[PDB]
């Protein structure tokens, strides 16, 4: 456990995640005092939602730490899929929170009661400052690719929520109208879902063993080039998938002539797919009868 | 649409499924409505639990239909992963809800409200008997020895027991903190129930060696090394594509004059007797 912290601060992304999580926990302690000072009704719920925020940050940090683990007998490809899975789980969770902004939104829309004890628009401003630091640190967010994407999208969803609550507060105070708050909430939910969609599409495609999108357009030319090799009869059982970001695994079976140069055909096929961007390739050569 | 008129009559197991999802979702709606009408949150949490129990079956049916789709260029392995993903997704959407419920639940730990509807006792007992019916005379809804019984019966009857106990504790003794802790307990039960499905799904999606294949692989490697002309094995990767369908890849180094046809046939025999459906053996000839 003593050496666990040294790995966290070594890598840039893990250290950034850890520092942002520590800042979130410091804000949690500040609110914990501020709320055990007899303002529980809204403050404590805000704290528990932003503790959930810290939970998402912890999930991203854990995925970053685990992805660097050494491969073993049970985990032959390593633990790199935790990079993808985090990006999945962070994305879906955001969709979940979008519904929380939707349903609660109509709780303030058709229902006249506007009971509210926001702490004199003070915790919201500090939370938005925290969100600005978060979006500044993880600007490269929008194997540590889908982790950073999901973390950045979560921080941006937080920023949109802060914009919504601050805008509603300035609406009811100065303009005095009440209809803006449900509209801002539903618009924030729509923006959250729209931003989340691409990351979810990439994560689902990777987990569904789909052909890599940046490899799909070059695969037929690779197939023709392998087919052009002297003594290759046919190609079959071609399979290409994404392990983690930029890491592609491919497998194929070649039928060749009964007396073909299998050494040379193997070297040429591996060259053809190394130029295409495949890192891990398996070529099974079957000699034909005639 | 009109084709379902005759499907509902000729079914037996699909009849059991149809009746199960007909009463479970309807009573989930009833419990949600009564929970919102009251201020009890244990009822709402139980309704969410059974709603996701039914959505698990609906997603399983949809995922089976998608899994039967023909493969193509983008999806060369097919859509067979859509089962595991679907289950995974439902599990996540359960845990989040429990994760939310707990939160709101402990909210009412600080400031407990008290609203009664003079039917809370009626609807909790009816929810319990609905769960008993669906778990005993229907055999569906199994949420997953002692662990088996915990996953099968307890994980979906303890929520009803808890809401019944909250109904007793709210009206008879009169204390105000019954449902905030009942909601927390229901959330804990939800997470505990969902853990094993998440474990299996995550193992498959992490490209892990199949657990039913792991203990036979060393004997397979020893048998492949025992083939004449084989020098060494390399870069073996075995993973679960879908349930009981395993993909394996390995590289062999062999003698510069070795019988590659025979070694290939023997390696495929070895790993087929281990239960590997798809196998890719790359063979490299050594210099010396």
């Amino acid at each position, epitope marked *: 456990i003593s050496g666990w912290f040294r790995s966290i601060l070594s890598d840039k992304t893990s250290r950034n995640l850890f520092f942002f999580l520590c800042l979130n926990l410091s804000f949690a302690f500040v609110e914990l005092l501020y709320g055990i000072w007899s303002n529980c009704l809204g403050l404590i719920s805000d704290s528990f939602h932003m503790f959930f925020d810290s939970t998402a940050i912890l999930a991203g940090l854990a995925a970053s730490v685990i992805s660097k683990w050494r491969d073993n007998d049970a985990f032959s490809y390593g633990y790199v899929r935790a990079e993808v899975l985090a990006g999945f789980v962070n994305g879906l969770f955001l969709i979940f929170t979008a519904f929380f902004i939707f349903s609660e939104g109509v709780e303030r829309a058709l229902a006249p009661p506007d009971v509210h004890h926001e702490r004199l628009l003070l915790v919201s401003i500090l939370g938005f400052v925290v969100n600005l630091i978060g979006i500044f640190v993880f600007k490269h967010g929008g194997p540590s690719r889908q982790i950073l994407q999901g973390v950045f999208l979560h921080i941006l969803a937080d920023t949109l929520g802060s914009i919504g609550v601050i805008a509603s507060a300035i609406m009811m105070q100065n303009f005095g109208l009440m209809i803006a708050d449900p509209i801002c909430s539903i618009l924030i939910a729509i923006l959250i879902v729209v931003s989340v969609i691409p990351l979810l599409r990439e994560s689902v495609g990777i987990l569904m063993q789909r052909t890599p999108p940046l490899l799909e357009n070059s695969l037929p030319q690779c197939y023709q080039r392998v087919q052009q090799l002297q003594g290759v009869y046919s190609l079959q059982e071609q399979h290409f998938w994404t392990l983690c970001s930029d890491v592609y695994v491919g497998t194929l079976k070649l039928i060749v002539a009964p007396d073909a140069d299998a050494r040379w055909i193997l070297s040429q096929t591996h060259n053809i797919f190394t130029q295409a961007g495949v890192r891990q390739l398996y070529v099974q050569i079957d000699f034909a009868a*005639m | 649409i009109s084709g379902w008129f005759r499907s509902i009559l000729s079914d037996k197991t699909s009849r059991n499924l149809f009746f199960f999802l007909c009463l479970n979702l309807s009573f989930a709606f009833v419990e949600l409505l009564y929970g919102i009408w009251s201020n009890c949150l244990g009822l709402i949490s139980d309704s969410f639990h059974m709603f996701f129990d039914s959505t698990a079956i609906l997603a399983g049916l949809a995922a089976s239909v998608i899994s039967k789709w023909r493969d193509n260029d983008a999806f060369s392995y097919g859509y067979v992963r859509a089962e595991v993903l679907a289950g995974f997704v439902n599990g996540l959407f359960l845990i989040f809800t429990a994760f939310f419920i707990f939160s709101e639940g402990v909210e009412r730990a600080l400031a407990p409200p008290d609203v009664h509807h003079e039917r809370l006792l009626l609807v909790s007992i009816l929810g319990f008997v609905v769960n008993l019916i669906g778990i005993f005379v229907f055999k569906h809804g199994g949420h997953g020895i002692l662990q088996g019984v915990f996953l099968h019966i307890l994980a979906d009857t303890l929520g009803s027991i808890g809401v019944i106990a909250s109904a007793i504790m709210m009206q008879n003794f009169g204390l105000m903190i019954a449902d905030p802790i009942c909601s927390i307990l229901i959330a804990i039960l939800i997470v505990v129930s969902v853990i094993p499905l998440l474990r299996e799904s995550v193992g498959i999606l992490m490209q892990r060696t199949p657990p039913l294949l792991e203990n036979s692989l060393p004997q397979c490697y020893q048998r492949v090394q025992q083939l004449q002309g084989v020098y060494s094995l390399q870069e073996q990767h075995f993973w679960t594509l879908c349930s009981d369908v395993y993909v394996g890849t390995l590289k062999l180094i062999v003698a510069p004059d070795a019988d590659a046809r025979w070694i290939l046939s023997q390696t495929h025999n070895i790993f087929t007797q281990a239960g590997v459906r798809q196998l890719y053996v790359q063979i490299d000839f050594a210099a010396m």
Partner: antibody
Amino acid sequence: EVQLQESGPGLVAPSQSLSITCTVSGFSLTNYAVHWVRQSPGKGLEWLGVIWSNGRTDYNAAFISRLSISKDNSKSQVFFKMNSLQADDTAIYYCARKLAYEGAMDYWGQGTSVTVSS
Amino acid sequence: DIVLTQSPASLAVSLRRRATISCRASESVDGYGHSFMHWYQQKSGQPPKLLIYRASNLESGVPARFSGSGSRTDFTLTIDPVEADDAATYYCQQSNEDPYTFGSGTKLEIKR
């Protein structure tokens, strides 16, 4: 006992076609590829093409538009057919049995000298 | 295509000595531990005879005095000891790339 013999016209008129028949013995065309290679004092040895045991043919890109290699397994002969014969094509032509599993030519015929002149 | 250059174009050696023939390729003719380069010997009025395949492997039935070496772009055929029967032209041929190409040839002069 493996051997290859080519029968072809020694003299070919320019702009006409050249046809050589290579008969092999000691091995089958069902599991062996056969290469066609020509040698001239001008440019040395030049690889023309190969035919495989299933009927697949691979040519040189310089002769793709005017070369055709065919074969018959039962009667065990390979037919070399070139079109548009010019003066630079005067050379000794060889049918060669490919070395198995290698990119070498392990056996050669005695080779026939083809002269393109009027 | 790949161009093979043989140096020297002619080399004169005496009996019971070592003859070295060097072939050089414009680009690497290697893949994954194998150099797909083959040495042939053509006597006068004879078809070429395969001596070395894959740049280091002695053909079945050729005398042990022939040896091959090299990798990537530079390859060497060595005859040691040189006999009187070795008076021929030695060629290098690559098979790494389509089309197959041969070397320029190198004549062996047996000094007596």
